[PDB]
């Protein structure tokens, strides 16, 4: 690999200003560590990095201080384990012009080998292979990448009882490394925007809540079979495929049709429905009124209760009138459906759907009119039998989504998870119940604070489509990793387990950074 | 010490070898001027520019001749002040890669301070911040930003009043600056910027050119309550909402209905009307024929003439024939109405409306026929009694518009304005005028040479949202500034005044250049 | 001119560190030739090319092995003369970033004259004008242009038809030219050039098929009125506006209404329809289902057959059970229409339309159902009565388009082309034709391996919106050029032609690389 | 505006918000739903009402989670500036959690919909008057 690049790092002028500083470059300090197991395949990539000053601790804080950089940086690797262990690793410096993934053939680029038995550390100096121009802390332009790959797999002769060893990574800047465009310290560009700050501990401990139910988040729920979600959900492209803005507020739809069933004008069950694409007061999407639940309706016939329906309180409002008609005000079961008045069927897709309401108990005096509005409150309560507390609501089938929505499915051994929260439940009027309030797990895709920050800031040039942004969770007994995708869905490396993970013994959350999607999030509980 | 500017430029310049053509750059020359208000908050940016040969007027000219350039530009600021105005500003050179909005702390950069009582000028240098390669003239690429921010708020003691004061900007090329690679001198023009051309002294000092009546523009009329207009009115995105063409031409609608009033065939008022959606003959819009007025109808019955009506001369022409009917030719009031003939009411809304004509004076012989044409001259005269007070025509409530029309409304102390003109008046049949000059004030919101130029050539790029393009009027005594918005409407700094500004004392008009829309336009008559 | 800069390129070049290949390249190799006539006017530009490793063919093969390049290329010119013809051409090396087209003069550039009376070749070195920045082979950036323009007109002493001569160009890399970043010439796909591989000899010869009728391409059809295409179309931005898959696939639509009109349940024409924009089971877009024809319907009346209709074979398929109905199996006309079920009228706008199907002959028993599905095969036949029929199908007026689809209209003398194929026709019981095939012409806008390849790999930033990618088609006798826009339309230089070009006597296809879109593509067949 | 101060219910431990110089205690005004006569037209096109709070909830939750005694000692306000599309003002926060403005004896509502931005001035003495320049 090149070495004349240093003369080119060498060129200065008006970026230097006064009084440049070598800073500390002398010794090697801990950047990172990686694990190598007998499990891992030849041609698998254990460690990768683009050349940057964010590869020492000292040059990452100086990055705020300086606006531009140039030159080489040295990477030192220490294999720890034993001299009795077979296997070999390959470290190679790759020039820019590349897309890294399944076709990027590490063992056919100029490279050096690292042997597992090495007692002493092995060093590489990584130069600049495009040294002609200063990089800012904006776009650097395309830079060389350092990749370490397994050439032949780790062997223990004493069997499978011990099966992994670690390799340390240490760095120091080289001689040719320099900085420029100092200015004075402040915050700047792409550096200040990262998905990291969305998730944090106080939100999961007790400050945060879900985006479907406004509940307190008690758990993490794995969903092996996948799911799809859009309403009040957001991505790292800054937009939503939903019809709700990211806050809880009343459901107002001005044009629907209203009727009642029982052939009696007083003491009857109220019905309201409308087709999708008439939400004239909603800017987000005219498909349904903001605040309307993303679930398919649940059939009930009087006096029988809906088994795990969404219920909210409200009543019927005509457009000419300043406030709703009181006689109509009652609890309603709400959902998305097709086939109103009396051929009702649930719908999982918004295209050709109908937004439907029916009162769970009798209204004082009904109303027959068309068109006329529906006015129902911000968050809902769960309708379900008396002492019911089985699994969670909605199940993946129950969630309604648009045809623009991308679905959440497993990637590798990484499984999508939903955030589980405590919801109010009711067993139908009076009687008895399993407890004082009863147990009930309502689930959402996201914590509402993450949803507000995806809507607030655009993170497209801040997490790549192949990556997850990763944080690690610490529990009193055990720890795990959790990931957020660019499509807004959250993942865990739990595989096919369904067990509820308890956030109530949560000590901590902290970022691990960007990781590629296929590679498994840690689960040790 | 840090490497010399000229040497690093030398490193930037290799494929070129003919070098510098100048021995002269010590004098400073006028770039621009900006205003500093008592409003402008601590931390606000009044003025910013990117590095270019356009930053200096001499380089701007020479740059036409050459394909490439490199080096620095020096910028000098002189405050006008008065010795009694306090406050202070900071000038910073922002190396490239720094996002610019209200989060940018501008005092953490390389910088100098400008005090508002400063007698002496303050200078700063902008070097080349990527001396690694030469810049093209025609496609600069990555360039440093000069930014000026308010360090301390503007302090007036208030011994009179003064709420805006100005800061001048002057520039010169550095001793490292250079041009290279001759190209065609014609590609980039010497002639003044594409909006500026729209307003020059002859449009206003004579000739006649208004966008409604085509009369002589005598004055400027401010509107405190705004207006909307679209017919022959263009915005700088080169789109119209109107129905007439900017080329003045005879009024022709081939399929309309004719009837008469007076209950007798001869010595009667002919009436003619057609639905809005009957105007097939127009290429621009099928909502009213070309050259038909944007004024509502003002009903009358004999002997009365209509007050504040648009009147034009013409007659009825059969649907398929080659010549109009001669006995029907007479003077007619033309206008928008609904429920013609029999429930006839004035309207300024097109949707279901009717375009109508009624004779002022009797036609020799009347006709009832459907369908028929209407043939009436290009431009109208105002019908109003003799002696009777002049109320400018049309009033805003009279002005007819399409639903797509943008409205003209105030900005701060800046108010939307109309151009006032002399238009012919006619009153009582055979009697003395009562007015020695025959006074009337007909109004337009845009002059026609400017309308035709905005329709021919798109200027979106020229004035982006939050700006007005500005010109100054110098009078035999006093001065004023006039601004043009994106939306095509013209603005004045006349506030709540309704007084007509007299343009007959105009000596000259010259472009100030584009300015922020919030800033108040000077009025000093 | 710039021939001193040999030593100043040698600072920018050397940080990379690589060998020089001299011994292989003793001789120059053929690049192109152009024609010079008595009618090519002074100021006209006959030939232009960008600096690129693709100019010498052997350097193109070597480019594969390397990820960067730099240094110059020699160009050698031979005039074919006679020695009795006067006239001159001017050869200039144009700076980077200077736009190319007919507006471009050589007037003030450094140049050499190429003489009509010359008998010796004339050799120019084209130096590198970018040498401080090494170029990528697969993302190169901005380069200079070599241009040859007519200074003096070709003049002949004598009459006859003889009015033209040829000028040949051959090239050799210079002693400054270099390849660097060998890495692994291992597993990159588009090292080979992405755009160039789209058209090949055996693909135009007999392997390729067209992307709408799946026929064998016999010819090229110019459309001098211009045209539009959205479905099964991709482009050099990777984007599309269609609904159908990149390959040909069968029609399955689960959600329709089926009915018939008549006086009986049997020996009737079956009708089925569903709305456009409702196909939520199509991954590509909901405009229609996959496999659905992008041409407007053909209205007909029982018992007559539609002409120039798209007909396909299939039947009614039960949505509840998932299974066909045998009695319904028949040939059907499938099309886009508006006005369903019974006011049907044709459209070319998808929005608010219905995707309609009607049987071309009697079904034994019909079915009236809602909902019911439609299941029809992938392959399509043209409906035409006996012998002599329509010239090509679809005509440009028949084609449907969806918003976002740009239309292709002529530029200068270049005209947009469609690809013609022989397609199967069926129509009217025991019909016949004048020929055995019954010579029926189906047209597609692209060849299907091109539609598939433009959907499989990225192509962004390779071809400039002003330029066309050019290939040369070579016949046993004569040759022509074909071009590709950024948009993914093909164009040819036949001007106001409608005549079909016969591809039967094709020997070869070679890439000519990008050329300005206003450049006429040559036609000598 | 609802509730009026006489309506507001409190525990005996409550600190009071009172003026300092030209600095006055302030409430945050909000749109809250109104309901009147059963079945009749609202009489108001926007449905106007002004519901009031003395602290925003993200600030309340942060002061409850994390103690800031050390940050602002008695005799100080912590200060931020509001920059509007036209004009500016400064806003201060006291130890006692109450927010203050340099509006004096004014009862006029300040419109926050024309807010361009807010930035911290930093901690300042409680006696100093907060700038108001709209």
XYZ file of C-alpha atoms in Angstrom, chain C:
525
model
C -1.150 25.163 -25.625
C -0.856 23.631 -22.032
C 2.126 21.614 -23.087
C 4.358 23.014 -20.458
C 2.181 21.473 -17.702
C 3.825 18.071 -17.870
C 5.814 18.850 -14.670
C 2.850 20.320 -12.802
C 0.646 17.303 -13.467
C 3.546 15.277 -11.912
C 2.743 16.473 -8.362
C -1.013 15.445 -8.494
C -0.275 12.111 -10.165
C 2.550 10.658 -8.007
C 0.734 10.215 -4.542
C -1.028 7.216 -6.166
C 2.360 5.405 -7.095
C 2.110 3.146 -10.204
C 4.022 1.756 -13.231
C 3.785 3.043 -16.855
C 2.774 0.782 -19.638
C 4.735 1.831 -22.778
C 5.940 -1.165 -24.879
C 2.364 -2.479 -26.021
C 1.216 0.825 -27.434
C 3.607 1.685 -30.330
C 0.739 2.072 -32.754
C -2.568 4.103 -32.965
C -5.961 2.465 -33.334
C -9.170 3.458 -35.101
C -11.701 5.524 -33.038
C -14.181 6.951 -35.667
C -14.635 8.658 -39.019
C -17.030 11.504 -40.180
C -18.022 12.897 -43.510
C -17.181 16.384 -44.877
C -19.341 17.909 -47.760
C -19.859 21.080 -49.813
C -23.179 21.686 -47.845
C -21.688 21.515 -44.252
C -21.678 25.257 -43.375
C -18.904 27.186 -41.669
C -19.428 27.240 -37.909
C -21.023 23.823 -37.892
C -19.620 21.117 -35.619
C -19.084 17.765 -37.301
C -17.350 15.758 -34.523
C -16.969 15.856 -30.700
C -15.617 13.585 -27.922
C -14.950 13.647 -24.124
C -11.727 12.378 -22.590
C -12.378 8.884 -21.335
C -10.610 5.571 -21.001
C -13.194 4.349 -23.572
C -11.630 6.105 -26.646
C -8.780 3.479 -27.340
C -10.320 -0.104 -27.280
C -7.387 -1.909 -25.567
C -7.328 0.899 -22.728
C -11.078 0.078 -22.306
C -10.244 -3.582 -21.611
C -7.529 -2.418 -19.149
C -9.912 0.036 -17.426
C -11.680 -3.098 -15.976
C -8.655 -4.056 -14.060
C -8.160 -0.612 -12.334
C -10.187 1.770 -10.185
C -8.473 5.089 -11.267
C -6.966 6.860 -14.235
C -5.121 9.956 -15.233
C -2.920 11.543 -17.986
C -3.459 12.403 -21.627
C -4.440 10.751 -24.932
C -3.114 11.370 -28.450
C -5.405 11.947 -31.354
C -4.454 11.450 -35.013
C -6.521 12.787 -37.995
C -6.311 11.624 -41.751
C -8.149 13.721 -44.504
C -9.052 11.521 -47.528
C -8.578 14.445 -50.065
C -7.980 14.335 -53.837
C -5.857 17.343 -54.030
C -8.391 19.441 -56.074
C -10.753 20.390 -53.223
C -10.313 23.569 -51.015
C -11.428 24.132 -47.391
C -10.470 23.754 -43.714
C -11.535 22.472 -40.391
C -10.474 23.785 -36.833
C -9.457 21.453 -33.957
C -9.625 22.852 -30.398
C -9.165 21.269 -26.868
C -12.038 22.866 -24.982
C -11.773 23.601 -21.163
C -13.801 21.591 -18.568
C -17.347 22.864 -17.809
C -17.778 24.634 -21.154
C -21.140 23.506 -22.578
C -21.159 21.710 -25.977
C -23.719 22.258 -28.749
C -24.302 24.222 -31.968
C -23.962 27.554 -30.106
C -20.348 26.757 -29.558
C -17.746 28.519 -31.707
C -13.971 27.655 -31.960
C -13.458 31.358 -32.634
C -11.364 32.345 -29.563
C -9.876 29.014 -28.698
C -6.257 27.695 -29.358
C -6.589 25.390 -32.351
C -5.021 23.682 -35.275
C -6.342 23.833 -38.824
C -6.991 20.674 -40.685
C -6.624 21.187 -44.383
C -8.595 19.819 -47.370
C -5.380 19.794 -49.391
C -3.551 17.910 -46.603
C -1.881 14.596 -47.430
C -0.215 13.864 -44.245
C -2.080 13.057 -40.985
C -2.169 15.714 -38.336
C -1.665 14.594 -34.647
C -2.802 16.497 -31.532
C -2.129 15.546 -27.904
C -5.249 16.004 -25.708
C -3.667 16.715 -22.296
C -5.333 15.968 -18.886
C -7.071 19.257 -17.676
C -7.950 17.688 -14.358
C -4.465 16.419 -13.070
C -4.663 17.481 -9.404
C -7.633 15.148 -8.974
C -7.088 11.524 -10.021
C -10.288 10.248 -11.688
C -12.331 7.197 -10.630
C -12.879 4.576 -13.518
C -16.556 3.980 -12.269
C -17.434 7.572 -11.016
C -15.130 9.843 -13.187
C -16.485 13.462 -12.820
C -16.034 16.426 -15.119
C -13.517 16.168 -18.105
C -12.545 18.364 -21.200
C -13.912 17.954 -24.694
C -12.173 17.645 -28.105
C -14.130 19.481 -30.837
C -13.662 19.741 -34.587
C -15.639 22.492 -36.445
C -15.804 23.758 -40.166
C -13.785 26.968 -40.693
C -13.860 27.033 -44.450
C -16.222 25.472 -46.816
C -15.449 22.482 -48.925
C -15.272 23.608 -52.565
C -15.162 21.498 -55.730
C -13.897 22.953 -59.232
C -16.364 20.732 -61.113
C -20.007 19.654 -61.349
C -21.354 16.073 -61.053
C -22.931 14.674 -57.984
C -19.522 14.367 -56.186
C -19.626 16.653 -53.162
C -18.128 14.783 -50.108
C -14.874 13.379 -48.628
C -14.213 11.592 -45.260
C -11.998 12.373 -42.315
C -10.748 9.445 -40.207
C -9.642 9.622 -36.464
C -7.293 7.131 -34.744
C -5.927 7.496 -31.104
C -2.996 6.280 -28.913
C -2.539 6.873 -25.195
C 0.313 9.350 -24.343
C 3.413 8.788 -22.348
C 1.709 10.628 -19.364
C -1.370 8.214 -19.355
C -1.745 6.033 -16.371
C -3.823 3.365 -14.624
C -3.880 3.053 -10.842
C -5.683 1.109 -7.995
C -5.495 -2.348 -9.354
C -7.056 -3.954 -6.181
C -9.192 -7.002 -7.147
C -10.478 -7.013 -10.772
C -12.501 -9.736 -9.209
C -16.294 -9.271 -8.800
C -17.428 -5.902 -9.821
C -20.200 -6.217 -12.517
C -20.307 -2.732 -13.984
C -16.565 -2.412 -14.345
C -17.423 -3.435 -17.912
C -19.504 -0.275 -18.452
C -23.226 -0.288 -17.441
C -24.816 1.793 -20.342
C -22.854 0.294 -23.199
C -23.958 -3.288 -22.592
C -27.706 -2.559 -23.130
C -27.613 -3.151 -26.914
C -25.562 -5.926 -28.382
C -25.231 -7.699 -31.789
C -26.805 -11.115 -30.947
C -29.511 -9.250 -28.912
C -30.507 -7.131 -31.916
C -29.915 -10.086 -34.283
C -32.215 -12.784 -32.821
C -31.872 -13.110 -29.146
C -33.824 -9.885 -28.149
C -37.687 -9.588 -27.972
C -39.734 -6.402 -27.440
C -41.173 -5.329 -23.992
C -44.965 -5.116 -24.958
C -45.962 -7.865 -27.450
C -43.136 -10.382 -26.918
C -42.443 -10.602 -30.636
C -39.267 -10.731 -32.684
C -37.903 -7.356 -33.678
C -37.971 -6.887 -37.495
C -37.642 -3.139 -37.552
C -37.391 0.355 -36.227
C -40.312 2.684 -36.536
C -39.870 6.454 -36.401
C -42.734 8.492 -34.939
C -42.234 12.126 -36.121
C -45.331 13.255 -34.147
C -43.573 11.988 -30.937
C -45.117 9.667 -28.288
C -45.410 8.688 -24.507
C -44.962 5.152 -22.700
C -45.135 4.290 -18.932
C -45.735 0.591 -18.413
C -42.988 -2.021 -18.381
C -40.568 0.884 -19.056
C -37.461 1.711 -16.912
C -34.920 4.351 -17.173
C -31.310 5.485 -16.459
C -32.491 6.927 -13.121
C -33.864 3.433 -12.162
C -37.366 4.978 -11.889
C -40.623 3.903 -13.409
C -44.243 4.930 -13.711
C -45.851 1.642 -14.774
C -47.650 -1.160 -12.970
C -46.531 -4.362 -14.743
C -43.544 -6.443 -13.807
C -40.296 -6.189 -15.704
C -41.154 -9.599 -17.406
C -44.420 -10.888 -18.830
C -46.724 -12.355 -16.288
C -50.400 -13.531 -16.144
C -53.433 -11.495 -15.074
C -54.917 -12.241 -11.706
C -57.417 -9.844 -10.198
C -59.466 -11.140 -7.245
C -61.867 -8.193 -6.838
C -64.266 -7.310 -9.758
C -68.036 -7.281 -10.634
C -69.117 -9.624 -13.451
C -72.321 -9.120 -15.575
C -73.658 -9.546 -19.125
C -76.311 -7.585 -21.083
C -78.862 -9.263 -23.163
C -82.297 -11.111 -23.153
C -80.899 -14.434 -21.794
C -78.508 -16.067 -19.214
C -76.844 -18.236 -22.042
C -75.060 -17.580 -25.411
C -74.191 -14.055 -24.195
C -70.901 -11.925 -23.932
C -69.421 -11.984 -20.460
C -68.333 -8.563 -19.003
C -66.117 -7.987 -15.937
C -64.559 -4.787 -14.552
C -62.642 -3.336 -11.500
C -61.377 0.221 -10.859
C -58.017 1.549 -11.684
C -55.745 2.334 -8.767
C -57.256 -0.597 -6.678
C -54.706 -3.434 -7.251
C -53.279 -3.719 -3.715
C -51.949 -7.234 -4.542
C -49.449 -5.709 -7.118
C -46.087 -4.920 -5.505
C -45.118 -2.374 -8.187
C -48.017 0.092 -8.114
C -51.847 -0.140 -7.583
C -52.741 1.353 -11.076
C -53.899 -2.038 -12.499
C -52.983 -5.625 -11.888
C -49.765 -7.204 -13.288
C -49.940 -8.279 -16.917
C -52.637 -5.703 -17.743
C -52.336 -3.932 -21.159
C -51.445 -0.265 -21.250
C -53.597 0.584 -24.269
C -57.220 2.024 -24.178
C -60.259 -0.321 -24.774
C -62.021 -0.914 -27.976
C -65.811 -0.482 -27.855
C -67.759 -2.932 -29.939
C -71.439 -4.149 -30.171
C -72.597 -7.851 -30.058
C -72.370 -9.822 -32.445
C -69.344 -8.032 -33.915
C -65.575 -8.244 -32.862
C -63.337 -5.353 -31.782
C -60.537 -4.113 -34.169
C -57.035 -3.373 -33.022
C -58.175 -4.661 -29.638
C -56.024 -6.454 -27.194
C -57.467 -9.918 -26.756
C -56.461 -12.531 -24.248
C -57.662 -15.917 -23.263
C -59.104 -16.573 -19.705
C -62.207 -16.764 -17.524
C -64.056 -15.885 -14.425
C -62.351 -17.079 -11.254
C -64.193 -17.448 -7.892
C -62.769 -15.077 -5.206
C -64.207 -16.933 -2.131
C -63.186 -20.518 -3.232
C -59.987 -19.528 -5.303
C -61.077 -21.428 -8.405
C -62.112 -20.919 -12.114
C -65.380 -21.298 -13.881
C -65.099 -23.391 -16.928
C -68.230 -22.086 -18.790
C -66.774 -18.585 -18.719
C -63.488 -19.635 -20.494
C -63.263 -17.711 -23.603
C -61.308 -15.055 -25.464
C -61.742 -11.642 -23.900
C -60.875 -8.030 -24.886
C -59.007 -6.439 -21.964
C -58.479 -2.652 -21.905
C -58.587 0.644 -19.938
C -61.839 2.545 -20.154
C -64.049 4.906 -18.367
C -67.922 4.831 -17.894
C -68.440 1.313 -16.588
C -70.494 -1.020 -16.674
C -72.664 0.355 -19.501
C -71.692 4.082 -20.496
C -68.178 2.921 -21.540
C -66.035 5.352 -23.387
C -62.148 5.215 -24.149
C -59.446 7.210 -22.257
C -55.640 7.544 -22.022
C -55.685 8.724 -18.433
C -55.564 6.058 -15.714
C -56.914 8.218 -12.920
C -60.664 7.594 -12.349
C -60.599 4.851 -14.919
C -61.787 1.169 -14.843
C -59.834 -1.806 -16.037
C -62.450 -3.624 -18.178
C -62.791 -7.015 -19.819
C -65.449 -8.157 -22.251
C -65.684 -11.577 -24.190
C -65.170 -11.359 -28.076
C -67.424 -14.377 -28.602
C -70.478 -16.004 -26.850
C -70.024 -17.851 -23.613
C -72.110 -20.901 -23.116
C -73.604 -19.633 -19.706
C -72.755 -16.262 -18.233
C -72.398 -15.236 -14.576
C -73.574 -12.207 -12.600
C -71.595 -11.869 -9.442
C -69.980 -9.330 -7.186
C -67.367 -9.821 -6.166
C -65.717 -12.197 -8.732
C -62.244 -12.519 -10.028
C -60.682 -12.520 -13.508
C -57.903 -14.893 -14.563
C -56.258 -14.366 -17.977
C -52.917 -15.490 -19.531
C -49.787 -13.318 -19.995
C -49.432 -13.426 -23.752
C -51.541 -11.220 -25.948
C -53.017 -11.284 -29.507
C -54.106 -8.427 -31.764
C -57.875 -8.518 -32.772
C -58.343 -7.755 -36.417
C -61.053 -8.912 -39.047
C -59.950 -10.598 -42.405
C -56.726 -9.519 -44.398
C -55.825 -5.841 -44.756
C -55.784 -3.995 -41.494
C -54.245 -1.219 -39.310
C -50.536 -0.197 -39.947
C -49.051 -0.695 -36.521
C -50.587 -1.338 -33.083
C -50.695 0.310 -30.557
C -50.891 3.655 -32.331
C -49.437 6.523 -30.090
C -53.123 7.791 -29.387
C -54.070 4.347 -27.951
C -51.347 4.231 -25.278
C -52.324 4.994 -21.669
C -50.028 6.890 -19.312
C -50.015 7.620 -15.586
C -48.860 10.992 -14.078
C -45.068 11.455 -13.890
C -44.466 9.899 -17.337
C -42.444 12.306 -19.681
C -43.274 12.175 -23.406
C -40.605 11.799 -26.121
C -40.862 14.404 -28.890
C -38.226 15.055 -31.738
C -35.053 17.276 -31.183
C -33.612 18.917 -34.318
C -33.449 16.100 -36.878
C -33.517 13.248 -34.244
C -36.939 11.606 -33.989
C -38.237 9.132 -31.241
C -38.572 5.426 -32.468
C -40.518 2.409 -31.450
C -39.418 -1.178 -32.028
C -41.536 -3.204 -34.517
C -42.297 -6.937 -34.319
C -44.456 -9.519 -36.115
C -47.412 -10.400 -33.820
C -50.285 -13.010 -33.887
C -53.763 -11.874 -34.990
C -57.030 -13.592 -34.608
C -60.419 -12.162 -35.462
C -63.733 -13.211 -36.750
C -64.697 -16.895 -36.997
C -62.771 -18.760 -39.843
C -61.207 -15.547 -41.028
C -58.181 -15.270 -43.240
C -55.476 -12.931 -44.622
C -53.481 -12.140 -47.806
C -50.393 -13.663 -46.366
C -50.036 -16.731 -44.011
C -48.709 -14.723 -41.092
C -51.290 -12.111 -42.240
C -48.397 -9.464 -41.701
C -49.577 -7.741 -38.466
C -47.155 -5.236 -36.768
C -46.816 -4.972 -33.015
C -44.652 -2.212 -31.567
C -42.756 -1.835 -28.161
C -40.833 1.182 -26.831
C -37.854 -0.779 -25.696
C -36.332 -4.274 -26.215
C -37.242 -6.466 -23.135
C -33.496 -7.401 -22.041
C -32.940 -3.618 -21.989
C -36.121 -3.084 -19.860
C -34.940 -5.936 -17.563
C -31.248 -4.659 -17.388
C -32.249 -1.002 -16.689
C -34.289 -2.454 -13.763
C -31.464 -4.704 -12.498
C -28.383 -2.315 -12.127
C -27.838 1.409 -11.542
C -27.182 3.901 -14.270
C -27.438 7.288 -12.481
C -24.918 10.096 -13.316
C -23.542 8.079 -16.366
C -25.354 9.823 -19.140
C -25.866 13.682 -19.073
C -29.476 15.062 -19.735
C -28.183 16.991 -22.686
C -26.642 13.924 -24.324
C -27.753 10.756 -25.892
C -25.851 7.432 -25.547
C -25.122 6.381 -29.102
C -24.622 3.013 -30.730
C -23.764 2.407 -34.380
C -25.722 -0.216 -36.300
C -23.787 -1.694 -39.218
C -25.389 -3.518 -42.186
C -23.968 -5.622 -45.074
C -24.447 -2.400 -47.057
C -24.601 1.024 -45.209
C -24.848 1.939 -41.453
C -26.972 4.160 -39.122
C -26.727 5.497 -35.459
C -29.356 4.908 -32.763
C -29.534 6.880 -29.462
C -30.796 6.494 -25.935
C -32.009 9.322 -23.752
C -31.803 9.588 -19.871
C -35.544 9.121 -19.973
C -35.341 5.599 -21.599
C -36.683 6.352 -25.007
C -34.855 5.452 -28.147
C -34.343 7.945 -30.922
C -32.975 7.812 -34.566
C -32.015 10.616 -37.093
C -34.699 10.281 -39.767
C -36.329 13.644 -39.198
C -39.955 13.840 -40.481
C -39.948 10.134 -41.579
C -42.641 7.536 -40.850
C -40.940 4.755 -42.910
C -40.072 1.472 -41.136
C -36.350 0.506 -41.092
C -35.708 -3.203 -41.847
C -33.124 -4.811 -39.470
C -32.775 -8.064 -41.632
C -29.323 -7.264 -43.197
C -27.668 -6.150 -39.743
C -23.958 -7.324 -39.371
C -22.940 -5.496 -36.166
C -23.526 -3.171 -33.301
C -20.783 -1.100 -31.537
C -21.169 1.615 -28.695
C -20.162 5.081 -29.804
C -20.463 6.562 -26.284
C -22.353 9.866 -25.410
C -23.054 12.613 -27.925
C -25.077 15.911 -27.484
C -28.858 15.297 -28.137
C -29.081 18.041 -30.720
C -26.409 16.113 -32.804
C -28.128 14.396 -35.692
C -27.693 10.686 -35.682
C -26.493 9.608 -39.204
C -28.587 7.611 -41.705
C -26.954 5.886 -44.668
C -28.895 2.761 -45.588
